[PDB]
Structure 1
Amino acid sequence: AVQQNKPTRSKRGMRRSHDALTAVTSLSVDKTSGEKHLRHHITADGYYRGRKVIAK
């Protein structure tokens, strides 16, 4: 129909050779509570860099 010979494990595995980027930027930690976040994202406590953010 559309291909000659069932494609090999090497040929299909090639996509895995580009994987080296570290996950979640390795996070940031809050220096006043010890919880983790992304590098400019807000805490679960309604705080950012030791002050109150957003109405909850």
Structure 2
Amino acid sequence: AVQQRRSSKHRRDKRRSHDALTAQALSVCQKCGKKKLFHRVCSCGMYGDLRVKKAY
């Protein structure tokens, strides 16, 4: 359960080729700016049509 050698740079880069972040959805914010993310509160301290949030 031990390594006999080290890991090369380029094989490590090929290993890290899979490193990628998921794509976050894009949704239009009508009443305010900064178009939001789908199934999230809108930008403007509000879900989208209903305001009940603050950025404190």
TM-score, with structure 1 as normaliser: 0.50
User: Per residue, is there more strand in 1 or in 2?
Assistant: 1
User: Per residue, is there more helix in 1 or in 2?
Assistant: 1
TM-score, with structure 2 as normaliser: 0.50
